[PDB]
Design an enzyme around this catalytic site. Structure first.
Site, short mmCIF file in Angstrom:
data_model
loop_
_atom_site.label_atom_id
_atom_site.label_comp_id
_atom_site.label_asym_id
_atom_site.label_seq_id
_atom_site.Cartn_x
_atom_site.Cartn_y
_atom_site.Cartn_z
N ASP B 128 -14.05 56.86 -3.26
CA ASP B 128 -13.35 55.94 -3.67
C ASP B 128 -14.56 55.31 -4.37
O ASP B 128 -14.41 54.04 -4.30
CB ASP B 128 -12.99 54.69 -3.03
CG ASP B 128 -11.84 55.50 -2.03
OD1 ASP B 128 -12.07 56.73 -1.01
OD2 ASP B 128 -10.42 55.69 -2.50
N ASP B 157 -10.71 59.64 -4.94
CA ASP B 157 -10.31 58.65 -5.90
C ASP B 157 -11.73 58.03 -6.50
O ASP B 157 -13.27 57.98 -6.65
CB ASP B 157 -10.21 57.28 -5.39
CG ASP B 157 -8.81 57.21 -4.30
OD1 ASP B 157 -7.52 57.73 -5.10
OD2 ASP B 157 -8.20 56.45 -3.24
N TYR B 160 -10.56 56.37 -10.96
CA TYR B 160 -9.33 55.32 -11.14
C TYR B 160 -8.96 54.99 -12.77
O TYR B 160 -8.89 53.33 -12.96
CB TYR B 160 -10.77 54.17 -10.77
CG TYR B 160 -10.69 53.99 -9.40
CD1 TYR B 160 -11.27 54.13 -8.91
CD2 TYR B 160 -9.05 53.02 -8.61
CE1 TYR B 160 -11.16 54.26 -6.84
CE2 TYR B 160 -9.06 53.09 -6.85
CZ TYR B 160 -10.07 53.71 -6.07
OH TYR B 160 -10.62 54.29 -5.02
N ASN B 194 -5.38 59.67 -3.90
CA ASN B 194 -3.92 59.05 -4.91
C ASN B 194 -4.55 58.57 -6.13
O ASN B 194 -3.15 58.86 -7.10
CB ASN B 194 -3.32 57.74 -3.90
CG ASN B 194 -3.97 57.17 -3.74
OD1 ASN B 194 -5.33 57.10 -3.07
ND2 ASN B 194 -3.61 55.90 -3.77
N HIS B 195 -5.25 58.63 -6.61
CA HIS B 195 -6.01 57.95 -7.67
C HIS B 195 -5.94 59.23 -8.61
O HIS B 195 -5.68 59.06 -10.01
CB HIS B 195 -7.00 56.63 -7.68
CG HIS B 195 -6.88 55.55 -7.37
ND1 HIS B 195 -6.17 54.59 -8.63
CD2 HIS B 195 -6.58 54.86 -6.54
CE1 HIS B 195 -5.89 53.24 -7.85
NE2 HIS B 195 -6.03 53.71 -7.21
N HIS B 279 -8.16 62.83 1.93
CA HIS B 279 -8.54 61.18 1.33
C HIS B 279 -7.82 60.20 2.23
O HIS B 279 -8.71 59.25 2.64
CB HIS B 279 -7.61 61.45 0.08
CG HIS B 279 -7.81 60.24 -0.74
ND1 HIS B 279 -9.04 58.92 -1.35
CD2 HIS B 279 -6.54 58.49 -0.77
CE1 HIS B 279 -8.89 58.08 -1.50
NE2 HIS B 279 -7.53 58.07 -1.49
N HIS B 288 -4.67 47.27 5.43
CA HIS B 288 -4.44 48.08 4.02
C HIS B 288 -4.33 49.35 4.61
O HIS B 288 -5.12 50.40 5.17
CB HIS B 288 -5.52 48.37 3.48
CG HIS B 288 -5.14 48.29 1.29
ND1 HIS B 288 -6.49 48.55 1.12
CD2 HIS B 288 -4.65 48.22 1.54
CE1 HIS B 288 -5.54 49.00 -0.79
NE2 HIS B 288 -4.36 48.94 0.00
N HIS B 289 -3.61 50.12 3.90
CA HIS B 289 -3.03 51.40 4.19
C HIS B 289 -2.70 51.78 6.06
O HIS B 289 -2.88 52.83 6.03
CB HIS B 289 -3.23 52.19 3.57
CG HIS B 289 -3.72 52.14 1.78
ND1 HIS B 289 -2.98 51.75 1.24
CD2 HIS B 289 -4.70 52.14 1.31
CE1 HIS B 289 -3.11 52.02 0.24
NE2 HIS B 289 -5.13 52.29 -0.36
N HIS B 316 -9.71 56.33 0.52
CA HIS B 316 -8.18 54.70 0.82
C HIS B 316 -8.56 53.87 1.03
O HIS B 316 -8.40 53.08 0.73
CB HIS B 316 -7.03 56.21 1.42
CG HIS B 316 -5.84 56.26 0.94
ND1 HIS B 316 -5.86 55.68 -0.49
CD2 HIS B 316 -5.11 55.40 0.88
CE1 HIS B 316 -4.69 55.33 -0.81
NE2 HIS B 316 -3.76 55.11 0.46
N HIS B 318 -10.91 51.13 1.68
CA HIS B 318 -12.50 50.47 1.20
C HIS B 318 -12.84 50.04 2.05
O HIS B 318 -13.01 48.40 2.06
CB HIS B 318 -11.87 50.03 -0.29
CG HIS B 318 -10.91 50.63 -1.15
ND1 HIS B 318 -10.50 50.41 -2.57
CD2 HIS B 318 -10.93 51.32 -1.61
CE1 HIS B 318 -9.79 50.83 -3.24
NE2 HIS B 318 -10.20 52.06 -2.80
C1 LIG Z 1 0.17 52.13 -1.01
C2 LIG Z 1 1.15 52.58 -2.56
C3 LIG Z 1 0.98 52.48 -3.52
C4 LIG Z 1 0.89 51.38 -4.97
C5 LIG Z 1 -0.38 51.91 -6.25
C6 LIG Z 1 -0.79 52.76 -6.54
C7 LIG Z 1 -2.28 51.49 -6.17
C8 LIG Z 1 -2.43 51.70 -7.76
C9 LIG Z 1 -3.78 50.55 -8.90
C10 LIG Z 1 -5.41 50.86 -7.50
C11 LIG Z 1 -4.71 49.90 -5.96
C12 LIG Z 1 -6.36 49.86 -5.12
O1 LIG Z 1 -6.49 51.50 -4.45
C13 LIG Z 1 -6.18 51.76 -3.80
C14 LIG Z 1 -4.77 51.29 -3.75
C15 LIG Z 1 -4.28 51.87 -3.54
C16 LIG Z 1 -2.21 52.69 -3.63
C17 LIG Z 1 -2.10 51.28 -3.52
C18 LIG Z 1 -2.99 49.74 -3.54
C19 LIG Z 1 -1.82 48.53 -2.81
C20 LIG Z 1 -2.65 47.34 -2.34
C21 LIG Z 1 -3.90 47.19 -2.38
C22 LIG Z 1 -4.98 48.92 -3.30
C23 LIG Z 1 -3.98 49.88 -3.20
P1 LIG Z 1 -7.11 52.84 -2.89
O2 LIG Z 1 -5.96 54.29 -3.26
O3 LIG Z 1 -8.06 53.63 -3.98
O4 LIG Z 1 -7.15 53.22 -1.55
FE LIG Z 2 -8.90 54.30 -3.44
ZN LIG Z 3 -6.43 55.98 -2.10
#
Ligand SMILES: CCC/C=C\CC/C=C\C=C\CO[C@@H](c1cccc2ccccc12)P(=O)(O)O
Ligand SMILES: [Fe+3]
Ligand SMILES: [Zn+2]
Ligand SMILES: *[C@@H]1O[C@H](CO)[C@@H](O[C@@H]2O[C@H](CO)[C@@H](O[C@@H]3O[C@H](CO[C@H]4O[C@H](CO)[C@@H](O)[C@H](O)[C@@H]4O)[C@@H](O)[C@H](O[C@H]4O[C@H](CO)[C@@H](O)[C@H](O)[C@@H]4O)[C@@H]3O)[C@H](O)[C@H]2NC(C)=O)[C@H](O[C@@H]2O[C@@H](C)[C@@H](O)[C@@H](O)[C@@H]2O)[C@H]1NC(C)=O
Ligand SMILES: *[C@@H]1O[C@H](CO)[C@@H](O[C@@H]2O[C@H](CO)[C@@H](O[C@@H]3O[C@H](CO)[C@@H](O)[C@H](O)[C@@H]3O)[C@H](O)[C@H]2NC(C)=O)[C@H](O[C@@H]2O[C@@H](C)[C@@H](O)[C@@H](O)[C@@H]2O)[C@H]1NC(C)=O
Ligand SMILES: *[C@@H]1O[C@H](CO)[C@@H](O[C@@H]2O[C@H](CO)[C@@H](O[C@@H]3O[C@H](CO)[C@@H](O)[C@H](O)[C@@H]3O)[C@H](O)[C@H]2NC(C)=O)[C@H](O[C@@H]2O[C@@H](C)[C@@H](O)[C@@H](O)[C@@H]2O)[C@H]1NC(C)=O
Ligand SMILES: *[C@@H]1O[C@H](CO)[C@@H](O[C@@H]2O[C@H](CO)[C@@H](O)[C@H](O)[C@H]2NC(C)=O)[C@H](O[C@@H]2O[C@@H](C)[C@@H](O)[C@@H](O)[C@@H]2O)[C@H]1NC(C)=O
Ligand SMILES: *[C@@H]1O[C@H](CO)[C@@H](O[C@@H]2O[C@H](CO)[C@@H](O)[C@H](O)[C@H]2NC(C)=O)[C@H](O[C@@H]2O[C@@H](C)[C@@H](O)[C@@H](O)[C@@H]2O)[C@H]1NC(C)=O
Ligand SMILES: *[C@@H]1O[C@H](CO)[C@@H](O)[C@H](O)[C@H]1NC(C)=O
Ligand SMILES: *[C@@H]1O[C@H](CO)[C@@H](O)[C@H](O)[C@H]1NC(C)=O
Ligand SMILES: *[C@@H]1O[C@H](CO)[C@@H](O)[C@H](O)[C@H]1NC(C)=O
Ligand SMILES: *[C@@H]1O[C@H](CO)[C@@H](O)[C@H](O)[C@H]1NC(C)=O
Ligand SMILES: [Fe+3]
Ligand SMILES: [Fe+3]
Ligand SMILES: [Fe+3]
Ligand code: NA
Ligand code: NA
Ligand code: NA
Ligand code: NA
Ligand code: NA
Ligand SMILES: [Zn+2]
Ligand SMILES: [Zn+2]
Ligand SMILES: [Zn+2]
Lengths: 423, 424, 425, 423
Positions: B128, B157, B160, B194-195, B279, B288-289, B316, B318
């Protein structure tokens, strides 16, 4: 135990380039369109369909598209798909295919306009195949006194992939076998594991390819981006079709599409919320035990949150009906991993017992767990008979019984309009 | 918004007409004798040829590759080049040049030693990454590390860019120019996060992973995968298996079929270290997640225990987390057996998604620390997995707020196949 | 219908599960170091790999090619393989095998000598072969010729499959099996004639040359061409230009542009013999297709005279004809100069489209014989262009009704660049 | 270089977010009942929907079309839209809007009268226009013509973009914006010229006509053609045949086969004016490109005389010429008949390639003026073909250095089928 190539259900309709393997399905979101499909073998032919109602008599023409595919050393015929649109509710239509050389005529009956108390009868078939047991099941469904109007098909169609090089002629015989039912009423298609046909050993690596060429679905009507998951509405039922063998992680198309689709459901327009998938989330048989755990961790809580009424699955070659239970409170360290009675939850029905290649799955986990209401290793089919907004009647017919006998039967009480205990 | 502005030094364009930019390399075959060489030209298509030579023999050779372009909403890419150099000598320094027609740029790399039992190798671990100021610090700590990593295992990731309006793919180009100062000289092994999905039907972009897959190629046919999003490579004494958290993995699917066959092909008498990248973590005690990995775990965890996977790397979350060797493979719906237990036959699960992203750390954890979790901390950093021989590897974690040489967590791995004594 | 029936011996299927059939080779590069191996498998895709080794040395190598398939109306093809073997040694016999997965079949060929000023070489000329009984006799006469052809120059109209209903592409498959006994052992150089067009909108096949181009590949990128329908090869002491009568050739078109640059690249001090192949003949005093070649003549004839092309071979007309060295390039619409005159700078124009087609000969000739025509006759047969050195090449015409060693017409060419002397009969 | 610089008024970009630019229309069907609406959006894809209604009634309707893009070397196109409006009413003024999603722009056109033996209609004749300052003058002279042209017959060479480095395709965009003030309000009939070929293998653009074909669509399927480069339309009392100088036309090629059957379809009692458009002139007595058209002439001249074509229009030569009525179809190699002769079934050949290109005239003429040449002059301008009825049509030539109402050449055409008087 597969029916041999010269069996009567496989006979080829006569005349030069006569259409064969005719099948229809719902072509739009609400019931006012139909997808007409068929295969010609002598030459590409025309993709036109001529149709008219009993009422009007006015003959209109729809025009569709023609496609072909190869699989290893097999070369398909010419596959046609054509969508007739703007039809009238609750009306008998005639349609004809093969307009260039040999014309054949069929008919269908559109559903009523969607509404809160619109009765309707759905057949339930999974894992059909083309063995002799397959033929008995189809006959039993055809002669049901309850008169099915649409088949919900929960996956695994032809079992052509059991044959060497997945011999696709067995797709064709299955197409001719099922025509006597699906050319006259829509079957709603779900993708199963036998449709995957992932065979890198013979450089065939496109998942679902023969199935996707032969069976089209109205997937754009629900704004889905793939044919393998979609929804339709019909009479009083909102039906949500899922793909066990596509991606469903957080953020993927199927996951994103389902979370949005549940928010569009309106229970005072279509009170019966039905989900179809191939692989059962709830299954007490040994064969395929706990394969559904992955999808279950993603979606089970959604199903309870939205008070889904019933979930139909196949894949296990047997019959099972769950109690209304949920298993959604687990958090790794809290030890809450046992299913519990939950009146907001759906009933899980396995119905993948229509015949396949002639084998039943009889080994069961002992003892029967609390979450299982009824289970038995017999061939047959189901019927889901909606009376109105509170009541629907489910019944299971066995092939060894008369066509009017019900070995299992239960009233569904609607989760939104009448959430009584229905054990 | 802690993203580095567009005019930062790390985003500068290499001067000259059609100067190659965003240069990056990765292993291009199964066993280390090939390299995929990748770069972007922005003024005109240019040549896809790579000139290259070893320090050992000094014979200039030419390899020809392919150019491609894509569009995403209203963005049009530059000219993307991918070229595989083949038949390289093991443990040998090579120079390579791209941009042969107008402005030429020169870089170098070192092939790995041939796969073998006691071949040491130092893998960096980065997840990430992003392009914030924290990302730049992590990258600096990696390149300055006295342990000197030879190859980066990247757990997903990347840029971004999908956080910007219309996924402003200019932020893929900037990220490519930022990471060049490392990935042009040593391979990074790509995992899809996922990004990278970039599923955006509202702007008619419905092909998943499209930008990622045009820019970052992988040698997936060398292990008979049918998709770039899962595959396998061997390097020195390691067999690395890469998985896709956001592809299908149901029983019968391509990814499921390939992983079942590939675990059977692993020859621990040749590569004793079995390492899996994905990931989304299977074990994770941050809020978180929390539990997003449950689905993949029910599918693949018993296989990882069965084939004695040494370590699984994920991102995934952070933050940083290291588990005990635990398993949770005894559950049967109704038998109540659903608490992870100690299992010296199971891999270690490490979360290492804390290289920077867009400047935000995941600091909320489930309390008290559960029995399966050994060490966890919400700080930016990176990891190093330093193989010594068939029995010992050394893992360390370095924090952005410490000196480049300070290890804040560290532990010895005892190989699950050659030396399975309690390393907890 | 003088076409050979489907159960004839020349059409027999090679035995064995997925045995390769319709094997054929052609030159695969500009100078002769490569060979394209082509064949079809009917039971399953099989391998595109070719094993090969030289007769003297014998280290066995594998080359890998590609497989493709096509549909035409309601015909579906089998599996078509094309595989290029490169970096060969000159003047060397090589063995090669195909069908490596199931049924292997072995063949061989002899690479040309290295290109050079005095390299002797023997080319057969065959046009409009088809698959009639007459077709079989000509191929028999060619393979038995004392002169020993080492490469066939083929001026177009191959299978005549398009005369069958829906262009029954099965008639491409038989023709492949029939011609195999020659073209699997020595390259045939391919020209595209009007029966390869296969434009049939009535059955929604609107892509010109589709069956032909799937089955017969040519090394066209080697001479910087962008289409398989025109290209250039060098072989021994000859420089051969292949053109497309049924493609565009207006000023600025790809073919026009390519011929222009290609004629500049010709170096008669390295390859003395400049040879052009096209399907429709520029000079033709037979009545069938009289004057169809006029459009391409107005474009390219002057270019042929300028560059002192030795000979132009064409087919289309189902008979034999050999012109005098003549040119017709002084016309200016109103000046009245529209008659061919003698021009020692011009090529000889030879029509040789008499190999057999579907059994019909073109016997209607315009009378009396024009002064631009040296010799003509309505008989089946084939030609040989037999290169001796930089100055001399002997052309001969063998009739099907004669012994295989008999020349019914025969002329010595004096090279236009090295021996520019009147060489008329 | 007398090309107009990029900041000229004629190249200004319509203001507003994603405003349509480069709007152009052409006939969308065989007989005149349809229209192809074309435009470019530069900021994002946008919608391909067109809104249109008759000025009379005013019931608003939406037509949906298709978006496409291309690349050329290091150029990347904007978002190109083509949308066909169908089933329009004859002789009716319609309004149409493009750009519905963000910035909308509104234009209009007037459909032609129904095809018929005596419908009058005025055609403008423009060729080799380009975007020099002379180009801007010619388009002004056509727009201001007291004759009032209603549809332009464009005989090829459009933007001359291929003269720029790597064919700077920006010069297509500028040309699109410059011609819009005419071609958005009335159709232009496109012919392909040699500057549209854009064959440049040295930068791996080897697909002939690639930018032209993306930007300018033609209704070629409506005449059973398989290519956009040859096709035919009917409008008022004219049958218009468009041919491709730089495609294949040997015997058995697609364009040859098409033309032969197409001439068999013409009916002179429905459309008495038989007009052929091509880029390279078959009769040309100028030095530039002398006898370039011989090859096509050997194939098609006799057909033109056999079907009594009224007029053949061409360009390519940057000047004006009008031929006498002649043919040169009797040659048989040895019979010596190679001079052109008066022939009253032959068309008149008119070279009209003098609309400005990039500012250069072709002034070098073959001397003395041959007999087949009636009139020739090297000056910039345009033409007008003004059909009065079935027997009479009036052709005139306006020069840029005269007032917009002066005809420096002028002649009556007597219809070859209905009134073949020596003219
Ligand atoms: C959880 C399902 C998807 C909802 C929104 C997609 C992400 C949009 C912008 C980036 C957020 C930060 O990135 C993390 C993250 C990824 C995905 C979600 C989150 C939600 C809150 C904080 C960080 C969430 P990550 O995937 O890099 O571990
Ligand atoms: Fe991430
Ligand atoms: Zn991620
Ligand atoms: C596979 O890799 C692992 C990881 O590297 C190897 O494990 C290491 O093995 C080395 C030995 O090769 C160990 O280092 C040695 O440590 C001893 C003991 O140190 C302790 O006690 C000292 C008092 O005796 C004290 O002074 C010291 O500070 C420490 O607290 C040192 O004495 C030794 O240094 C002296 O000997 C060397 C050898 O001649 C001389 O060169 C020096 O000048 C010194 O006089 C040396 O540094 C290390 O501790 C091991 N690491 C771990 C994490 O276990 C492994 O080696 C093999 O396995 C270990 C467990 C031992 O059995 C080794 O003997 C054995 O070879 C590698 N496997 C193989 C097969 O090589
Ligand atoms: C280039 O190739 C030509 C054609 O083959 C050569 O001309 C041929 O040369 C042969 C001798 O090498 C001649 O054959 C001899 O004929 C005589 C007289 O009838 C016999 O006594 C003797 O036994 C041979 O059979 C052959 O007739 C001749 N062909 C023609 C059409 O002229 C040519 O050779 C060169 O030119 C000829 C004219 C002779 O002067 C040769 O000796 C001379 O070298 C070849 N060129 C070269 C440089 O070798
Ligand atoms: C792709 O599409 C995006 C989304 O529309 C473009 O970004 C948008 O650009 C508009 C310019 O046409 C911006 O509107 C203007 O903003 C300025 C600054 O406040 C105002 O003064 C003015 O009155 C307009 O409102 C719009 O804000 C912007 N939207 C977003 C979400 O970024 C994008 O354009 C590219 O980026 C922008 C920022 C400008 O630099 C554009 O000129 C530039 O091309 C589009 N990209 C492409 C390549 O077409
Ligand atoms: C929906 O359909 C149900 C099944 O037909 C109706 O229940 C049935 O009603 C019959 C007479 O109304 C009665 O004899 C049946 O025993 C009964 N069947 C069952 C399984 O209950 C139902 O009728 C309403 O609901 C039930 C509970 C009674 O209160 C009826 O009197 C109600 O009218 C139908 N519901 C509606 C809203 O129409
Ligand atoms: C078709 O239009 C022509 C051009 O206007 C008509 O000719 C013109 O007829 C006028 C009478 O209204 C007359 O004053 C003009 O001098 C004459 N113009 C020319 C250039 O001749 C033509 O009229 C018929 O044909 C001519 C030959 C005369 O005989 C007229 O009297 C005829 O009516 C129009 N043709 C038809 C069939 O209407
Ligand atoms: C299939 O069932 C139908 C109806 O029961 C029957 O008529 C037919 O003979 C059966 N065919 C076979 C092959 O069992
Ligand atoms: C394309 O290449 C030319 C040639 O150097 C250059 O001047 C021009 O700016 C480039 N344009 C684009 C859009 O890349
Ligand atoms: C990023 O890090 C490098 C190396 O530490 C440094 O030279 C550079 O100035 C930094 N740039 C930014 C924008 O932080
Ligand atoms: C593109 O065409 C140019 C023209 O010479 C050539 O140099 C280049 O290699 C071509 N690229 C290909 C065939 O991929
Ligand atoms: Fe099944
Ligand atoms: Fe012929
Ligand atoms: Fe011009
Ligand atoms: Na997930
Ligand atoms: Na070297
Ligand atoms: Na599964
Ligand atoms: Na011709
Ligand atoms: Na021309
Ligand atoms: Zn199944
Ligand atoms: Zn011919
Ligand atoms: Zn021109």
């Amino acid at each position: 135990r597969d029916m041999p190539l010269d069996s009567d259900v496989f006979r080829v309709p006569p005349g030069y380039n006569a259409p064969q393997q005719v099948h229809i399905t719902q072509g739009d979101l609400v019931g006012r369109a139909m997808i007409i499909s068929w295969v010609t073998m002598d030459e590409p032919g025309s993709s036109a369909v001529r149709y008219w109602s009993e009422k009007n008599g006015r003959k209109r023409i729809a025009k569709g598209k023609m496609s072909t595919y190869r699989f290893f050393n097999y070369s398909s015929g010419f596959i046609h798909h054509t969508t007739i649109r703007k039809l009238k509710y609750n009306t008998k239509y005639y349609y004809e295919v093969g307009l260039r050389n040999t014309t054949r005529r069929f008919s269908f009956i559109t559903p009523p306009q969607t509404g809160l108390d619109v009765p309707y009868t759905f057949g339930l078939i999974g894992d059909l195949g083309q063995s002799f047991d397959s033929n008995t099941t189809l006959s039993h469904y055809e002669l049901s006194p309850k008169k099915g109007q649409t088949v919900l098909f929960v996956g695994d169609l032809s079992y052509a992939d059991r044959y060497p090089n997945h011999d696709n002629v067995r797709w064709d015989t299955w197409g001719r076998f099922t025509e006597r039912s699906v050319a006259y009423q829509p079957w709603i298609w779900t993708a199963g594991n036998h449709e995957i046909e992932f065979a890198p050993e013979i450089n065939e690596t496109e998942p679902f390819k023969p199935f996707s060429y032969r069976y089209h679905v109205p997937y754009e009507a629900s704004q889905s981006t793939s044919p393998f998951w979609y929804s339709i509405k019909r009479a009083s039922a909102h039906i949500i079709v899922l793909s066990s063998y596509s991606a469903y992680g957080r953020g993927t198309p199927q996951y994103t599409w389902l979370k949005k689709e549940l928010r569009k459901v309106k229970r005072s327009e279509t009170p019966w919320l039905i989900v179809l998938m191939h692989s059962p989330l709830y299954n007490s048989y040994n064969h395929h035990f706990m394969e559904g755990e992955a999808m279950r961790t993603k979606f089970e809580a959604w199903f309870v949150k939205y008070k889904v009424d019933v979930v139909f699955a196949g894949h296990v070659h047997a019959y099972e009906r769950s109690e209304r239970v949920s298993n959604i409170a687990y958090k790794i360290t809290n030890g809450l991993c046992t299913p519990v009675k939950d009146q907001s939850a759906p009933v899980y029905i396995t119905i993948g017992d229509a015949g396949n290649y002639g084998v039943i799955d009889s080994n069961m986990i002992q003892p029967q767990p609390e979450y299982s209401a009824f289970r038995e290793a017999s061939f047959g089919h189901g019927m889901f008979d909606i009376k109105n907004r509170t009541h629907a009647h489910f019944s299971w017919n066995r092939n060894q019984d008369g066509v009017a006998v019900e070995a299992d039967s239960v009233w569904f009480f609607n989760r939104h309009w009448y959430p009584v205990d229905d054990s």
